[PDB]
């Protein structure tokens, strides 16, 4: 619907559609994106007009007089009046041809009248629209287009049709209209609106969402350019400072004040077109000094400046003898001109060692601009030259009177010894024996000394930076350095490093939502301490005394993301620097070396990474035949000796169905997790569409037009996906040289378990527990992808994508830099200047764009080196965790590695490492050796394999077990090494009770 | 093992609390958003990396 | 650890910067400029443990 | 034809023809299986690979 | 261990000390440069915004403030780029550790 | 430095670290600003097919017990004369199995 009811404060409800609402612009229209803009979206009153109804009113902008307002009506001034209706040819006006009657400043009446026949200029009477002044056609606007949907009129005279400013009249005081329509559905609206700052989302030049920056959380939303804030910490300001006192501190001096009055007599005439023209014969009179009225120097310690204006009229003969009428009335003003200070700011405690005003240009450092301001324009007529010397002997004061006023222990605007700012000034006990004032490394005043008693005062900012904690789109806490309320929070607590304000009731056992270091913030706003992770400990290679061996194992799955490749870009240096202009190319022929260097660097980087990636990826046909969910769910490829197993997947299939590729995928060889990661984190690489011209070009086509070519990357993603699929399918490949003979996944898992530790319980095996744990872990991971490791992986991929996008965005936006030239467009420069003058302008653009390209190349090379190191790490991970079991401790995740699977991810891959997690320990009495006695011959026996622990069972029989898993086995004589001596920690035994 | 992470308030660095400078910087708010987002994401990634290493 | 932390290398409390009891030091001035160094003593303690 | 200059899946031969570059194929990795009919590499030749590190 | 303790208050000890000293110095200089970038005028009458607004009319002062804004944004972008590069290098070092 | 230590001065147990294939030895030469390594690897050109068994279920009347290969990296198979042999999986180097190559366990697998 087109009718909405304004909320408190005059804000459009979030449920609106903005069917007849546009963004007002003086230039080009944004097609899509989010923008923080100052737009007339504060709806004071919304007048709904029904079908066949009549809306007739005369509105003055300084007069919020309103007729009907569905909703509350504000009492502020109205800036823009908007008509949101289909302004077709079936809209009738009660004033005849006139649709709008404008009363401008000075009583001038202007009309916007549409006729069915063309009206000649300065004469009186498809629809052709005109601006009429006194019944004569003053300006031709054009025929009414068939698609007008909104007309916005501003109090300053600007007209916006469908969002674009097509004409501006004089500032308007009052607007009379009388309209009626019948084809405007059910209701059409007239909105009185005021400007406000808001974040607007636009899609296809149409408004979709308007977020007003009216609250603290909305301020954060506008600062982040998004209406959905992720949980985290955001920098904010503690408070806002306004309406503070003023403090002035100056060195002691005599008090003598001089008033300098400048008299300006302006001469005005009426031109042939009725515009008031200010005469250059206007006179300036300075105070008399040394028999002269043309030069005046300040000779006291303090001074003030004032201007008095008189007006006279002429009749094109430069004889001023009349009084200026309403049209010819003007007021004399003084503008800055080329001076480093303004005339109106001289009475603002500015200090000089010498200040003289003159009417002659010689010896002058700068000049002011004397101008006459009329009701419509402002014209410069004279020049007032200034000769000044920097110092502190002479000060300009607001008025004649001690100038030293100091406000303490409160926010104030200070001017101390020439340094100005906003801050709080306090008295300190410190004794600094040198200097008058002190500044920081950034040049900000930190303290100053009173020259009467030597007391040192410190200066601090009124407002400081704070950190706001946002969880679920609301502010729950704030870390700040000042013990004052902020962001609507009242309760607070003290921390050794800061103050923490919160919604929590402070005069806590909760799960923190957002954490950094040892600090955590929960959902209810409470502050919690984050301690270091605790673990049971590492198993030690001890074989003496009571030792513990892990026994009961479950499965843990850990997710890791590693980047493998970048998104390579080719740049045409000539097209980037010169937008196809032949003259710019001729100029760039002298810089051709720089373009050659840039192109060579980019091409060599791309070639090296392609060579690196090419040698890493490979597939196997037989492995790819088994790499699918359908293959793992059937027994077609199983060796006939596995007739008991229903299929390849078995009990593990419930977890393998989300990792293996399936036919229910957008692309080939794609799995569920891969689709989730490529859709929840991330377009078209066809270039033939850019040159078609069938629609407005998108961002990629525009970048191509700028000479920026993103090289193909879909092929690399397909190669990575097939590579990971082949790696997954090779686990179950029974033999290599023949057909696709497959083994059950359970058999491969058993082989991996035997590699970890020799399994000695052939009959009583429980792989169902491990399979169920794996299935539940994979299910949780899949749910989380659509678990800190999953969060870290997601953050890493998101960061990679964002950085890749921003790198090209910055380079593209660097093309709108003028680089101290009249324009950033080469065609514009060559269409306005002669070639000798235009070449100098084009040279600056050339140098700036070459510098930007060099910066982009350097950043790209650094990124490429980092990704090369990351690719080396990924290759090591694939070789030592997926294609084999590594003997390196802790390399394939935290725990005892069993096997790893891999999937393709944006610009890289993700690994699922499966580890054994112990849940119990067995305690055994371990011995370092056996001291065997056979009468007079006593000899020692040590375990040959240093990784085995020797212990004794209840029946006094020696057993050996590995320390990774508790898999006891009977010791034999071949497991021992005979040595001469014995250790004190050995277990005594006889020849009869020896193993084997 | 780790760096010394820094948070920057872009508005306070560019404008020393001046409201008029903030009004002017409302037209560059995108650059400040990019800077803050980059710094915050870098700090969060290193904190996540360090957290999983120590025990 | 003490030898390395004293022969090669301050205060991370922000509440002292806004007190105004003396002239601000380098860290407080940087804070005033909108530059916040995040806590690192906790990380050093974690590494030591 | 044998491509002379390649990038990704695109290759250009000496005669100007455009060819597709597919991923490298291999027989596969030997698996630690000791059940059923298995294959063990027997006849070996020597391959030399060159790597540069700064 | 006694010799190492004496040296800390043996080429490996010297290399370790040099590495830690370099890390600390680089970390300090990175922030020092950014802080000192705030006294650049960037072709304006002053590097203080309060000074500019106390001497010029708002139409004249906005043009002066725009140059400072652009210069400080450029300095912040440079600082961010350097920080990200340092972070990547330290990430590789952390993997080694 | 890792490459020199683990590929030139020794043979690394890491799979695929010293080139694509089964690493035999590496040599090194000096290059501008660095070095180049020649990695020598074994490239197989054929495969031998054997019938491998995961263990031996030995029966001695009423006492039935299992035997597993002590070294997990060895494949157990049978020759034409019904004699058990062990071979590594990297190279086909069959050898006669002895009692010291087996571990005795209670149960048997299918
Ligand atoms: C690498 O991987 C290993 C696992 O392989 C991780 O180690 C585990 O880490 C967790 C978390 O610290 C440990 O779990 C904790 O155990 C404490 C001891 O439990 C007692 O009570 C149980 C009752 O069933 C007994 O079985 C046990 O023997 C103990 O007597 C618990 O107290 C902890 O409880 C947690 O939850 C409760 C309820 O909310 C809280 O009150 C507690 O404060 C606490 O938060 C917790 O269960 C686990 O024991 C470790 N396992 C092993 C084998 O070491 C490593 O942490 C991981 N490393 C890294 C860096 O990630
Ligand atoms: C790591 O190192 C290994 C070697 O250790 C590499 O693996 C070899 O890769 C090559 C290239 O893919 C493989 O060679 C190909 O074998 C195909 C199968 O051959 C059939 O026919 C021969 C006939 O003698 C039989 O012996 C064999 O058993 C098969 O029945 C061939 O068809 C391929 O022919 C190529 O050339 C012809 C002629 O131009 C073309 O028509 C083909 O399309 C094709 O291009 C080719 O010979 C080789 O088998 C692999 N060896 C092993 C042991 O796997 C890895 O590729 C390498 N990895 C990386 C990443 O570099
Ligand atoms: C690059 O190499 C890969 C891997 O060897 C090739 O994949 C193969 O693609 C073909 C064509 O799609 C597949 O054969 C066909 O599949 C369909 C399935 O519906 C079937 O209808 C046909 O009878 C036929 O078998 C083939 O299975 C597939 N191979 C593997 C191992 O997955 C790919 O085609 C190669 N690309 C090029 C351009 O040569
Ligand atoms: C994420 O992992 C958790 C790990 O606990 C999974 O929860 C577990 O889910 C299984 C299957 O539904 C539950 O088993 C069932 O237990 C009940 C109670 O004993 C029993 O009556 C049922 O017959 C069945 O055996 C198991 O209890 C449950 N565990 C817990 C602690 O809740 C969860 O399913 C995983 N999520 C996904 C999406 O896979
Ligand atoms: C740094 O390492 C050197 C390694 O030599 C240490 O010097 C050694 O110090 C020990 C303990 O004082 C000396 O032992 C003594 O030797 C004399 C001579 O035989 C004997 O009379 C004493 O009863 C005692 O056994 C040892 O000789 C000495 N070695 C040398 C080559 O001087 C030195 O102490 C270490 N520094 C620190 C601060 O720990
Ligand atoms: C707005 O225009 C309507 C016509 O569209 C005006 O109504 C007319 O008023 C005159 C003068 O009294 C009558 O003679 C006509 O009969 C009226 N027409 C209709 C259709 O009612 C109306 O007065 C105008 N409103 C203003 C100027 O406030
Ligand atoms: C256009 O606006 C002018 C200025 O407000 C109006 O002229 C005023 O008319 C009122 C009528 O009571 C007088 O009291 C004022 O003195 C007039 N001002 C001037 C400057 O002369 C004028 O009537 C308006 N024209 C319309 C509504 O058609
Ligand atoms: C202007 O006309 C348009 C159509 O040209 C109106 O929009 C349509 O409104 C009807 C009735 O609700 C919908 O069924 C159509 O889908 C709308 N068309 C669109 C959205 O393209 C619009 O309401 C009219 N505006 C006014 C103010 O009367
Ligand atoms: C500025 O001052 C000059 C000089 O007095 C004025 O020009 C004189 O005007 C009078 C009166 O009309 C003439 O009689 C003289 O002949 C003029 N002198 C010259 C040299 O032209 C001028 O009118 C003043 N301008 C004002 C008051 O706007
Ligand atoms: C600097 O110190 C002098 C001396 O204390 C201050 O002058 C005093 O002002 C108070 C308040 O008006 C009077 O009661 C004292 O009698 C003054 N003492 C004198 C004149 O010796 C002076 O105000 C201080 N300056 C500033 C800027 O705070
Ligand atoms: C290892 O622990 C066992 C128990 O698990 C200890 O054996 C017990 O020792 C206590 C204390 O002397 C006796 O009261 C019990 O009778 C013992 N139990 C058995 C079954 O012998 C044993 O002493 C511990 N061993 C070591 C080396 O500390
Ligand atoms: C490892 O898990 C097994 C299986 O749950 C545990 O053995 C059972 O433990 C429960 C709880 O005490 C007893 O009720 C059962 O009688 C046990 N079953 C058997 C067959 O012994 C075992 O205790 C766990 N291991 C350790 C070292 O705690
Ligand atoms: C194994 O037997 C030897 C030999 O009897 C024991 O060594 C004796 O230890 C006692 C103290 O426990 C000494 O007083 C004897 O002199 C030792 N005898 C010799 C010949 O050295 C040894 O303690 C026994 N070990 C264990 C673990 O019980
Ligand atoms: C392993 O392959 C061998 C052949 O190399 C298979 O043995 C043959 O099996 C076929 C099909 O039953 C028989 O017709 C032949 O007589 C067998 N040959 C011999 C020499 O026995 C054997 O079946 C395969 N083993 C497995 C487990 O699949
Ligand atoms: C490994 O190579 C050997 C040596 O060439 C092969 O043995 C010969 O194979 C050829 C070709 O079939 C026969 O003509 C010869 O009689 C074979 N010689 C011997 C001594 O057996 C052998 O076949 C190859 N191994 C495999 C598994 O193919
Ligand atoms: C007055 C200053 C107090 C400083 C307190 C610091 C607390 C929080 C800062 C967290 C910033 C770390 C970056 C991650 C930000 C995020 O999660 O979005
Ligand atoms: C030549 C006789 C002495 C000169 C007198 C000058 C008059 C006023 C002194 C102004 C300077 C005050 C400096 C403050 C010194 C301090 O307290 O540390
Ligand atoms: C415009 O309409 C009037 C009134 O009906 C008519 O006299 C005139 O001819 C029309 N003009 C055109 C160009 O149709
Ligand atoms: C406007 O036109 C009318 C009618 O001809 C005329 O009397 C009047 O003088 C005109 N006004 C102006 C300001 O030219
Ligand atoms: C300014 O100072 C006066 C006293 O001189 C005080 O009443 C007033 O509140 C102050 N204004 C502020 C702090 O804004
Ligand atoms: C200067 O002008 C002021 C008013 O701004 C007036 O009070 C004063 O007397 C004038 N001084 C002269 C004319 O010398
Ligand atoms: C500063 O002086 C005040 C007033 O005498 C005193 O109360 C305070 O304790 C002093 N502070 C210090 C740090 O000496
Ligand atoms: C906070 O809790 C106290 C008691 O601890 C209670 O008196 C007070 O009303 C609470 N404040 C709230 C709910 O705002």
Residue numbers in the entry:
A (entry chain A): 265 to 389, 402 to 677, 682 to 787, 801 to 975, 982 to 1085, 1098 to 1307
B (entry chain B): 857 to 911
C (entry chain B): 967 to 975, 982 to 1021
D (entry chain C): 803 to 856
E (entry chain B): 1077 to 1085, 1098 to 1185
F (entry chain C): 1186 to 1295
From the publication, what sentences describe this entry?
FCoV-23 is a recently emerged, highly pathogenic recombinant coronavirus responsible for a widespread outbreak of feline infectious peritonitis. All coronaviruses are decorated with several copies of a homotrimeric spike (S) glycoprotein that is the target of neutralizing antibodies, drives viral entry through receptor binding and membrane fusion and contributes to pathogenesis. FCoV-23 S-long comprises an amino-terminal S1 subunit, folding as five domains designated 0 and A–D, and a C-terminal S2 subunit. Collectively, these findings identify APN as a bona fide entry receptor for FCoV-23, which seems to have broad receptor species tropism, mirroring that of CCoV-HuPn-2018.
